[PDB]
Design a protein around this nucleic acid. Structure first.
Ligand SMILES: [Cl-]
Ligand SMILES: [Cl-]
Ligand SMILES: [Cl-]
Ligand SMILES: [Mn+2]
Ligand SMILES: [Mn+2]
Ligand SMILES: [Mn+2]
Ligand SMILES: [Mn+2]
Ligand SMILES: [Mn+2]
Ligand SMILES: [Mn+2]
Ligand SMILES: [Mn+2]
Ligand SMILES: [Mn+2]
Ligand SMILES: [Mn+2]
Ligand SMILES: [Mn+2]
Ligand SMILES: [Mn+2]
Ligand SMILES: [Mn+2]
Lengths: 95, 84, 106, 99, 92, 104, 97, 78
DNA sequence: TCAATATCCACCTGCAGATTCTACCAAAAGTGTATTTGGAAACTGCTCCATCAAAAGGCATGTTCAGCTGAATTCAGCTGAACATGCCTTTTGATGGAGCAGTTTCCAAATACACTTTTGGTAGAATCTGCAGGTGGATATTGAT
DNA sequence: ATCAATATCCACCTGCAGATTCTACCAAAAGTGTATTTGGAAACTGCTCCATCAAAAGGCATGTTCAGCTGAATTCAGCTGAACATGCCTTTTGATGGAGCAGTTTCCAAATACACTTTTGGTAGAATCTGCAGGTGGATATTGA
């Protein structure tokens, strides 16, 4: 009867402490942060999916995700989003 | 056997509306606004409650979850952060 | 030792989970190894951008715990994010104070 | 004196007031009935996760607060400082809520 | 080769207006239409099921799905037709 | 002996099915989802085509064109509402001129 | 020498263009504009003839619609002439900016 | 170049819009709006293009574009 | 109300750009067959929804009263509409001539599956701690005179 | 320009919700082979694109007048806002009873997963048509006198 429920809290936090070590998020606020996290994971995952479909392509690779991110995020966030994501990838693929 | 619900649309008082209007940054308010607002509200509500109750019904439940409302607000295009 | 893809990727966000949410999301048959890495990366980034901004709002309020109000203030004061979350509504975030000029006294 | 504030001096005071806050401006209980009253007239014998009624109220006010802004704009664009029904209508009419 | 609903659109046309014909360009719009709606129903259909932690989109989904997409009265027939078209299929 | 005929439909039930599978909507697809969906598509299709056919007759043409589909859509509360965010290319707008603009 | 009151040919043009459905912008100029705008996004691109048509249909349809809302606004301002301030508000409420 | 879009043409659109009298400043204003409309649609299309590693903008690209702008268009790309 | 001027509206007429036809080869779309497994039934476990039960004020409500705002005129400029006048960029119709979208082969490089082996993330239980929610005194802001 | 009548502010001030650490387990996430494919290379075509005429041809660009139309004053009820007085009816903790939402197993009707056949639906040529758009003429509508 553990009836476990996942989340992003743990991480929203880690990152919070990363930019503003001093401050801390409340709760209703953390709640909002998840909504945000999920809302974009889908906006992106979707677009990614839709994109991949139009090309008769079978799988969603980082490429997809990127173009997605590019279609979704506006101007700046888009640029910074990419570099950040590209970078993080090659590091994962650096063995 | 609880009581009959009726005309509750008046719960949305005149004061309650002008407060909303202020946050909306409105200075002067015509006497008609109030009833017009009440109507606009009912319509907004109806539509979201409808769709919501549908997600409920479809899930074979008798209780409306926050999620029901959240999904309802989202397909309507009023995505809400804070509950789902 | 076992390696968290996140660590191998240098991220705080769960890569292992992002990948899983993708598979179970019926977005497509298959999923590349980089997809999660890259997705989580963007998520975590954006998350940081909001928080950095949000947190400040908090400080200017003399408050040390970020609250919805702060999230709103942060989001609505930044074109980028406000554009992004234009159709999004933050519960308990109130409105950005703004009064039409025409409304002020002579 | 007695001391009366010129009509509108307070109204303004009230905008700076509520735009500074974040709580709900419609009363809880009265609102909850409208939900139950409306809900009821669709599917009978329904129940309500408390937080669901909150999602709704958060949603409604946020809607009305926003609608009102556009309205205030229409009034002003009408060389009026008073919002009237015709303002709410053109706003929605343009918003695409209904034609 | 590129599939299309042109055929079925026509077959349906010659049923309500056996007399009326249909412009090529006009036929294009009719396709756009079918795809768009197919898409819409199918979406909410999956979306919905997904909400219920279930792994299969059945007619149940499609129907509710139609009820969330189509206008109160336009939805009825859409619904009746659906149930009908099924029982008939599922019977014989 | 095709489900489409078995279900008594003019639309491609079999195809709708394959499309539901390829489309990536769920893992498994009920056997009635196609037949059903298929029906709904066909039905809306007729509705349009019918009004569009009419649109054309009263116009004295025997062949349905885009405008026709447009005039048929925008004149129906239901449809207009449905495709309120869609533009039928080459369908122009409905003839309507605000009162305030007419001469005295 | 026959002349019509101001606004007569205007109402006529309305009755006339609301009836017709052909595109109202010259294709060449448009196509040129498209390719130009596009060139800032990726160099040496080719356009499907039909891709440009989509763009023009979409574009014109858009403006035609935006003008409608604009009029309502202008009329709301108790005018009969549409000014910039009108297109602006219309857009603004529309949530385009 | 945006000037390619002329007064008469702009005049006609408004006309189909049901507009009677037209202030002179409008034209310039209209060009802007018009230009942004395209900037946004294309910017997106060209992206669907570039993703598909093509060098040609297909009507379908434009469609999938106008579709996420919330400008769904019936008639092209099937 | 005459009176032209032009603008529509009509009932043909027929040449020409597309609609039915026509005549056929492959992917789908059916058919058994052989597993497979989703999730529709019980069956509880126990969470959280619907209901009182009283008091408290915090706020509606209804009423005065009159500031000043929305409506109603009038009235000039000033600005667009309506028109010939004259070029001049579009439009069209046809070619060639490369580009490409699109196909096949081909085939490592990736991705799916399974089999168990860890260990990180999610409850609850304790262990803190930012922050209402209250109180004064500057400090400001209004508004009468 | 002064100054009395109220709002704001802006610290200062502890006792709590609520947060923020503690443990403690499972449900993922990681690992290690195997087996099944993407979908990215290279040539290789055959459609659209593009770049070039050029042919007049309808549109635009352009100044003239002027009719309105818009933006400016100037009143002038009354309809909103500001303030009170008077109570109602939300709030607000505090319990429960017990309608359901969730877990947990079974087990079967309904879905894959496979070849293995038929049937149908996209081409790439034929065989007619529905209208466009050009006539005439009849009014009709728009405008001076
Ligand atoms: Cl990848
Ligand atoms: Cl009104
Ligand atoms: Cl089914
Ligand atoms: Mn920092
Ligand atoms: Mn199972
Ligand atoms: Mn008076
Ligand atoms: Mn005034
Ligand atoms: Mn080549
Ligand atoms: Mn651990
Ligand atoms: Mn305080
Ligand atoms: Mn004059
Ligand atoms: Mn009372
Ligand atoms: Mn029970
Ligand atoms: Mn056949
Ligand atoms: Mn004709």
């Amino acid at each position: 009867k553990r009836s476990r429920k996942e989340s992003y809290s743990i991480y929203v936090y880690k990152v919070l402490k990363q930019v503003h070590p001093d401050t801390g998020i409340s709760s209703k606020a953390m709640g909002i942060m998840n909504s945000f996290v999920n809302d974009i994971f889908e906006r992106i995952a979707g677009e990614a999916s839709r994109l991949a479909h139009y090309n008769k392509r079978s799988t969603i690779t980082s490429r997809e995700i990127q173009t997605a991110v590019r279609l979704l995020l506006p101007g700046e966030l888009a640029k910074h989003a990419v570099s950040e994501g590209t970078k993080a990838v090659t590091k994962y693929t650096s063995a | 056997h609880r009581k009959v619900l009726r005309d509750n649309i008046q719960g949305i008082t005149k004061p309650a509306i002008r407060r909303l209007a202020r946050r909306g940054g409105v200075k002067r308010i015509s006497g008609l606004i109030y009833e017009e607002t009440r109507g606009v509200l009912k319509v907004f509500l109806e539509n979201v409650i409808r769709d919501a109750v549908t997600y409920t019904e479809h899930a074979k439940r008798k209780t409306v979850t926050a999620m029901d409302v959240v999904y309802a607000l989202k397909r309507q295009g009023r995505t809400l952060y804070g509950f789902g | 030792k076992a390696k968290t893809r996140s660590s191998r990727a240098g991220l705080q966000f769960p890569v292992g989970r992002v990948h899983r949410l993708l598979r179970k999301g019926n977005y497509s048959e298959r999923v590349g190894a980089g997809a999660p890495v890259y997705l989580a990366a963007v998520l975590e980034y954006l998350t940081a951008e909001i928080l950095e901004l949000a947190g400040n709002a908090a400080r200017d309020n003399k408050k040390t715990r970020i609250i919805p109000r702060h999230l709103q203030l942060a989001i609505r004061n930044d074109e980028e994010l406000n554009k992004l979350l234009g159709r999004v509504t933050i519960a308990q975030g109130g409105v950005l104070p703004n009064i039409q000029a025409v409304l002020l006294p002579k | 004196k007695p001391h009366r504030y010129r009509p509108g001096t307070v109204a303004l005071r009230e905008i700076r007031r509520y735009q500074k806050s974040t709580e709900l401006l419609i009363r809880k209980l009265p609102f909850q009935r409208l939900v139950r009253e409306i809900a009821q007239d669709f599917k009978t014998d329904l129940r309500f996760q408390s937080s669901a009624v909150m999602a709704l109220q958060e949603a409604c006010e946020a809607y009305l607060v926003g609608l009102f802004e556009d309205t205030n704009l229409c009034a002003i664009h009408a060389k009026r400082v008073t919002i009237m029904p015709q303002d709410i209508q053109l706003a929605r009419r343009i918003r695409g809520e209904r034609a």
